[PDB]
Amino acid sequence: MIDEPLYPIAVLIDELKNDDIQLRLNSIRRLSTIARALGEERTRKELIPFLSENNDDDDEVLLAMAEELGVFIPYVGGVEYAHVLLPPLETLSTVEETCVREKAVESLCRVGSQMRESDLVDHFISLVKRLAAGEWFTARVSACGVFHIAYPSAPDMLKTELRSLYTQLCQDDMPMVRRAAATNLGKFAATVESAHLKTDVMSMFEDLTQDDQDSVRLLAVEGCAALGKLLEPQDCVQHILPVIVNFSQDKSWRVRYMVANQLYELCEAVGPEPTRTELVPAYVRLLRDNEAEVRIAAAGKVTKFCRILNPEIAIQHILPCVKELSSDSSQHVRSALASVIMGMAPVLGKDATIEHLLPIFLSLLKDEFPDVRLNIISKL
Amino acid sequence: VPGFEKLANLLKPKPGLKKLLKWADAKKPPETVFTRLRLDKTGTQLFDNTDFPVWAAYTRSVAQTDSEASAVMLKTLVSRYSDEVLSGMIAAAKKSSKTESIATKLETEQMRTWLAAKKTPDDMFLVFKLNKAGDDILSSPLLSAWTNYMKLSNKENPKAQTTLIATMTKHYGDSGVSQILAAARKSPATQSTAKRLEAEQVQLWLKKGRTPDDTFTLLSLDRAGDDLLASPQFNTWMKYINYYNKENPDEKTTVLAKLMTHFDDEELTPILVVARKVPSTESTAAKLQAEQFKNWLSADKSPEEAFTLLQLDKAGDDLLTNPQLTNWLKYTENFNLNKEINEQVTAIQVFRAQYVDDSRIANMVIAAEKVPNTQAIAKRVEDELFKGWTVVLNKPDDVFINLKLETVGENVFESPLWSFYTKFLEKYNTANPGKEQTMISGLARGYNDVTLTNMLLKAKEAPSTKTLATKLEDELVQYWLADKKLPDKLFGYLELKESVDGILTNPVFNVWLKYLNAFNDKAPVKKALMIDTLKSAFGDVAVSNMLFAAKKDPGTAKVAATLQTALLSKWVLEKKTPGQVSAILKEGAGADVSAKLLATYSAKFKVRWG
């Protein structure tokens, strides 16, 4: 009744360590069937340990293992036993190959998000601590991506320890770890108490923005929008706005492109006065940037960022840039400007629109490229 | 130490439970308890002594915290052991159950003592002699303790963190680190850690700004000479290049570009060709080759140089079986596309410039078209030959010369290149409706009149060439006619002056007669006479003697008699006296026969003159 039907499962288990990689992959794909044939207790005790201890295969097999383990909770007995999936994934998170360890981090996040608070405290915090203190850089890179899972349910002592650990990771001697810390900074900060958001998270952000490598600084600057959306206007102006202003005139066009993308979002956060004194000159410089990509990014938003502005300030500062952009050399710049320039008819008001926007509208109407025309003609 | 000092510690008793409790009630300092306990004379066996836990418990009791007890114990210990020796003893004690907790506490206090002195992890690397482990560093019993201190220092000094790879590099150079790792991966006990440290080394090189150029020598790729693609260091270098490109998007340089930095085309291309032949490097080589071709196309490199670089100038007779021929043909096609006639470099031009003439290429094509795996490439090469002939508006006789068919001789009709000649003839005639050429034009250019006539006559006797030879003989007659050949000149050209004897059975003479009849058939002002040519060539006596001789042979009797009558008429018109005629006649006949020929001659002489 049982032996004959499950003989094929035994064959799959045997093929788990077959010479041919295709059969190993197939057995990995049928891990749930093998676990059901085994039973929960012994999926926990034979199968998961086998996956943990036999991990020297090709990257395809390891990636498949990470994928399968990410959705393997029911086959180990449910949430109460979800923690037994952590060890193997942890090992997979230390693999150098990017796809494997990134999938392992994603699966760790899935399992943790399904885990319940007592189990998080009992196992996931220790997992995060081990990864953060790992002697291999891949482990610390992976650790940067699981802090937000463990932080919310941790006790206050563990929360302080985790803030210190993330600060250390931001300070890491290996640049890739610092890049991962910058990448996950905003998302971890979303889980931190207001009190510590404005002291510890700010320290991490400012350390990253002063990092010696270009890539770390670029990644840190990318998080300005998220951090500002998480902060009070006071601290936003004090901490993030100067970074935006400084990097708007960085020699790297990619950093300036990032800043141009985030300016309008930061405008709401800082308020009208700081936007007038601080954001407007940076936006003007980005609109008149040396690189066409930055000019495109800024032109796509002149309307949004004039809508919040005083029409006096808009007319004085933004319109000259809009004029030059209308006669810009790049067809893509002209297209981006035209796709949003019409939206300023109501914001400026008939009196100002007539003196300033009329000629640009007609010029864009008679453009040499159907892109610009269509962009201005469709939204009439 | 001294004699009889040993045989008094026999008598001197162990303190015991009561003595410990009395000391504790009197607050005897732990150092004192240590000295009276027998732990002065243990040295590196201190932690293995049964009385060590007793002293540890006492010192813990006297203190308030675990840290204070550990600090007092360490102070008692940091004045009796060196840092290395104490660390080694602690590490050994940590692997044992009874002493694990106390050893860990002592290590914690020890690391705090080092940290308060602000000895960096580099300083403790020096203290542990990890400078001196060399190839065995990964097996050092103090490496784990150093790693623990490194983690603690990184925790307490986030602004000044370090790594094992960085310290190893600082004290061993990139070279010592590389060879340490190489040695460590030969022992299975240290292989995994060595691989991890190799990855760490790549990350460190990226951190220190090293470019792929520097890591080329750092991986010792130069040490592989011309066989670098086979090295695992090459795979590491490719991984490094991917990392670097991700870090430096605008300074992104491909693998082939850096290989060009370290190799010029002349040596790099052969490396790619050889690697392409090897299955294990087949893929990588292919990709590099692909990139190389694109890069030549961007540089507009001549297909002749591409031919040389791919080693095709070495192929010789095996050119069509060379695996790189298809790639070179494709590159040449890409190079010439959108170029004009004067600016393009064609396959035939490269072949000739490389000293592989048309006949050699054609022979290689003929051989390769029989082999199924080279048939397609052979047909492409044949198309290249025909395109080359057509572009310069070669006539069929030009192509006949290009195939060296003038050097083949008798068997030219059976040569495999004769098919190419006739194929081009058909093509050219179809493409020139007003200027059609004949199949004999090439042969006439390549061979002179007598040689060509003899060749055709010989081929006519072979059944496989009889039809073609007959057609070509007629064509040759027409060719002579179109060229205004005087029959008497042609007689000389055919070397028919050699002998009057048997000329009436000479096949070459028959061909000449065919031409003479054709020449007379198209209305010359003066109908050409056979007897005139014979007399001019051999003289009256020789011709008359030959006619007398030939009249006795049934196969030539009729023609000989006709010619003799014509000769008599010729003598009559030139007013030859009967005495001269008799003198001529009796060089080849008797008195009576000569008499009757003389009388006939006199009769028709009288008829003409009298």
Residue whose pair of structure tokens reads 């007629």 in the numeric block:
B474
What one-character-per-residue DSSP string does B5-67 give?
Answer: THHHHTTSPP-HHHHHHHHHHTT--HHHHHHHTGGGG-GGGGGGSTTHHHHHHHHHHHSSSHH
Q: Report CB contact under 8 Å: B158, A175.
A: no
Residue B484, sorted as left (phi over 0), alpha (psi -120 to 50) or beta, turns out to be left
Question: Residue type at B420?
Answer: F
A62/A94 Cα distance (integer angstroms): 11
Nearest to A287 by CA among A236, A230, A325, A331: A325
- Residue A243 neighbours by CB under 8 Å, 6+ apart: A205, A209, A221, A224
Q: How many CB atoms lie within 10 A of CB B61?
A: 12
Q: Which two tokens stand for residue B221?
A: 């790729």
**B36 located within any domain:** yes
B306/B296 Cα distance (integer angstroms): 8
Q: Which two tokens stand for residue B393?
A: 């508006």
Q: How many CB atoms lie within 10 A of CB B17?
A: 9
Q: Which two tokens stand for residue B108?
A: 């914690």
Total number of domains constituting chain A = 1
What is the 3-class SS of B250-310, one letter each residue?
HHCCCHHHHHHHHCCHHHHHHHHHHHHHCHHHHHHHHHHHHHHHHHHHHHCCCHHHHHHHC
Q: Which two tokens stand for residue B138?
A: 């990964």
Tell me, what DSSP letter sits at residue B163? -
Q: How many CB atoms lie within 10 A of CB B525?
A: 4
Residue whose pair of structure tokens reads 């050409």 in the numeric block:
B528
Q: Which two tokens stand for residue A267?
A: 């405008």
Question: What three-state secondary structure class fits B91?
Answer: helix
A241/A236 Cα distance (integer angstroms): 6
**Domain of residue A25, CATH code:** 1.25.10.10
**Cα torsion angle, A28, A33, A34, A36, sign:** positive
Round the CA-based radius of gyration of chain A to a whole number and report it: 27
Q: Report CB contact under 8 Å: B200, A137.
A: yes
Total count of residues recorded for chain A: 380
Total number of domains constituting chain B = 1
Per-residue b or e along B432-443, where b marks 16 or more CB atoms closer than 10 Å to that residue's CB: eeeeeebbbbbb
Q: How many CA atoms lie within 13 A of B400 on its CB side?
A: 22
A60/A53 Cα distance (integer angstroms): 17
A323, A332 contact by CB (below 8 A) = no
* CA triple B542-B546-B547, angle to 5 deg: 120
- Whether the CB of B195 is below 8 Å from some CB of chain A: the reply is no
Interface test with B, best of A56, A97, A168, A179 (most B CBs within 10 A): A168
Q: Which two tokens stand for residue A41?
A: 């207790």
**B164 located within any domain:** no
Those of residues 246-285 in B touching chain A at CB distance below 8 A are 247, 249
Question: Residue type at B450?
Answer: V
**Please, is B585 exposed, middle or buried when counting C-beta atoms within 10 Å of its C-beta (0-12, 13-18, 19+)?**
buried
**B239 located within any domain:** no
- Whether the CB of B158 is below 8 Å from some CB of chain A: the reply is yes
Report chain B residues whose CB lies below 8 A from the CB of A215: 247
Residue whose pair of structure tokens reads 């610390």 in the numeric block:
A140
Q: Which two tokens stand for residue B119?
A: 């000895």
Interface test with B, best of A129, A131, A174 (most B CBs within 10 A): A174
Domain range for B23: 1-117
Question: Residue type at A210?
Answer: Q
Tell me, what DSSP letter sits at residue B496? G
Q: Report CB contact under 8 Å: B199, A138.
A: yes
**Cα torsion angle, B268, B270, B273, B278, sign:** negative
B509, B517 contact by CB (below 8 A) = no
Cα-Cα-Cα-Cα dihedral of B459, B460, B466, B469, to 10°? 70
A224/A230 Cα distance (integer angstroms): 10
Phi, psi of A263 (to 5 degrees): -60, -50
B392/B389 Cα distance (integer angstroms): 6
Measured between CA atoms, how close is B140 to chain A, in angstroms?
Answer: 17
B71/B65 Cα distance (integer angstroms): 10
Q: Which two tokens stand for residue A52?
A: 């943990």
Tell me, what DSSP letter sits at residue B463? T
Question: Residue type at B76?
Answer: T
Report chain B residues whose CB lies below 8 A from the CB of A210: none
B305/B303 Cα distance (integer angstroms): 5
B51/A370 Cα distance (integer angstroms): 94
Q: Report CB contact under 8 Å: B196, A215.
A: no
Interface test with A, best of B143, B146, B148, B161 (most A CBs within 10 A): B161
**B336 located within any domain:** no
**B388 located within any domain:** no
**Please, is B299 exposed, middle or buried when counting C-beta atoms within 10 Å of its C-beta (0-12, 13-18, 19+)?**
exposed
Nearest to A119 by CA among A64, A58, A78: A78
- Whether the CB of A68 is below 8 Å from some CB of chain B: the reply is no
**B101 located within any domain:** yes
Q: How far is CA B255 from CA B117, B269, B280, in A?
A: 49, 14, 18
Phi, psi of B217 (to 5 degrees): -75, -30
**Please, is B186 exposed, middle or buried when counting C-beta atoms within 10 Å of its C-beta (0-12, 13-18, 19+)?**
exposed
- Residue A232 neighbours by CB under 8 Å, 6+ apart: A198
What one-character-per-residue DSSP string does B107-125 give?
Answer: HHHHHHHHHHTT--HHHHH
Nearest to B177 by CA among B192, B191, B190, B164: B164
- Residue B552 neighbours by CB under 8 Å, 6+ apart: none
* CA triple A340-A345-A350, angle to 5 deg: 165
Q: Which two tokens stand for residue B359?
A: 């006949």
Q: Which two tokens stand for residue B325?
A: 């021929």
**B85 located within any domain:** yes
- Whether the CB of A55 is below 8 Å from some CB of chain B: the reply is no
A153/A23 Cα distance (integer angstroms): 41
CA of residue B268 relative to chain centroid, distance: 10
**B65 located within any domain:** yes
- Residue A132 neighbours by CB under 8 Å, 6+ apart: A140, A143, A165, A166, A168, A169
- Whether the CB of A250 is below 8 Å from some CB of chain B: the reply is no
Q: At what angle do helices A253-270 and A214-222 cross, to 10 degrees?
A: 30
Domain range for A210: 4-378
B271, B263 contact by CB (below 8 A) = yes
Q: How many CB atoms lie within 10 A of CB A379?
A: 12
Question: How was this one solved?
Answer: X-ray
A71/A87 Cα distance (integer angstroms): 15
What resolution, expressed in A, was reported for this entry?
Answer: 2.3
Question: What three-state secondary structure class fits B351?
Answer: helix
Q: Report CB contact under 8 Å: A176, B203.
A: yes
Residue among A136, A173, A176 whose CB faces B162 most closely: A173
- Whether the CB of A99 is below 8 Å from some CB of chain B: the reply is no
Q: How many CB atoms lie within 10 A of CB B339?
A: 11
What is the 3-class SS of chain A, one letter each residue?
CCHHHHHHHHHHHHHCCCCCHHHHHHHHHCHHHHHHHHCHHHHHHHHHHHHHHCCCCCHHHHHHHHHHHCCCCHHHCCHHHHHHHHHHHHHHHCCCCHHHHHHHHHHHHHHHHHCCHHHHHHHHHHHHHHHHCCCCHHHHHHHCCCHHHHCCCCCHHHHHHHHHHHHHHHCCCCHHHHHHHHHHHHHHHCCCCHHHHCCHHHHHHHHHHCCCCHHHHHHHHHCHHHHHHHCCHHHHHHHHHHHHHHHCCCCCHHHHHHHHHHHHHHHHHHCHHHHHHHHHHHHHHHHCCCCHHHHHHHHCCHHHHHHCCCHHHHHHHHHHHHHHHHCCCCHHHHHHHHHHHCCHHHHHCHHHHHHHCHHHHHHHHCCCCHHHHHHHHHCC
B25/A176 Cα distance (integer angstroms): 58
Q: How many CA atoms lie within 13 A of A308 on its CB side?
A: 20
* CA triple A109-A111-A113, angle to 5 deg: 65
Q: Which two tokens stand for residue B351?
A: 């072949």
Q: How many CB atoms lie within 10 A of CB A60?
A: 16
Per-residue b or e along B150-179, where b marks 16 or more CB atoms closer than 10 Å to that residue's CB: bbbbbbebbeebbbbbbbbbebbebeebbe
Q: Report CB contact under 8 Å: A135, B147.
A: yes
Q: How many CA atoms lie within 13 A of A67 on its CB side?
A: 12
A164, A156 contact by CB (below 8 A) = no
- Whether the CB of A56 is below 8 Å from some CB of chain B: the reply is no
Q: How many CB atoms lie within 10 A of CB A42?
A: 12
